[PDB]
Amino acid sequence: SICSEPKKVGRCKGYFPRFYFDSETGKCTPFIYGGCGGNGNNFETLHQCRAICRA
């Protein structure tokens, strides 16, 4: 699942703080997104990063 992606920002550098399932650590964790060039493992909240990947 999108669980498997690491953090990826994007081409755009806008300060959109988002959460990734930091599968590198096994955590949900914040990162800066930047709208343009996003990936799937990119969630508004720990709530979502959690719910979608790990109950």
Curated annotation (Swiss-Prot):
<dbReference type="InterPro" id="IPR036880">
    <property type="entry name" value="Kunitz_BPTI_sf"/>
</dbReference>
<keyword id="KW-1015">Disulfide bond</keyword>
<feature type="site" description="Reactive bond for trypsin">
    <location>
        <begin position="13"/>
        <end position="14"/>
    </location>
</feature>
<dbReference type="InterPro" id="IPR050098">
    <property type="entry name" value="TFPI/VKTCI-like"/>
</dbReference>
<dbReference type="GO" id="GO:0019828">
    <property type="term" value="F:aspartic-type endopeptidase inhibitor activity"/>
</dbReference>
<dbReference type="GO" id="GO:0004867">
    <property type="term" value="F:serine-type endopeptidase inhibitor activity"/>
</dbReference>
<keyword id="KW-0166">Nematocyst</keyword>
<feature type="disulfide bond">
    <location>
        <begin position="12"/>
        <end position="36"/>
    </location>
</feature>
<keyword id="KW-0964">Secreted</keyword>
<keyword id="KW-0646">Protease inhibitor</keyword>
<comment type="similarity">
    <text>Belongs to the venom Kunitz-type family. Sea anemone type 2 potassium channel toxin subfamily.</text>
</comment>
<comment type="function">
    <text>Active against serine, cysteine, and aspartic proteases. Can bind vertebrate trypsin and chymotrypsin.</text>
</comment>
<feature type="disulfide bond">
    <location>
        <begin position="3"/>
        <end position="53"/>
    </location>
</feature>
<dbReference type="InterPro" id="IPR020901">
    <property type="entry name" value="Prtase_inh_Kunz-CS"/>
</dbReference>
<dbReference type="GO" id="GO:0042151">
    <property type="term" value="C:nematocyst"/>
</dbReference>
<keyword id="KW-0722">Serine protease inhibitor</keyword>
<dbReference type="GO" id="GO:0005615">
    <property type="term" value="C:extracellular space"/>
</dbReference>
<protein>
    <recommendedName>
        <fullName>PI-stichotoxin-She2a</fullName>
    </recommendedName>
</protein>
<feature type="disulfide bond">
    <location>
        <begin position="28"/>
        <end position="49"/>
    </location>
</feature>
<dbReference type="InterPro" id="IPR002223">
    <property type="entry name" value="Kunitz_BPTI"/>
</dbReference>
<keyword id="KW-0062">Aspartic protease inhibitor</keyword>
<dbReference type="Pfam" id="PF00014">
    <property type="entry name" value="Kunitz_BPTI"/>
</dbReference>
<feature type="domain" description="BPTI/Kunitz inhibitor">
    <location>
        <begin position="3"/>
        <end position="53"/>
    </location>
</feature>
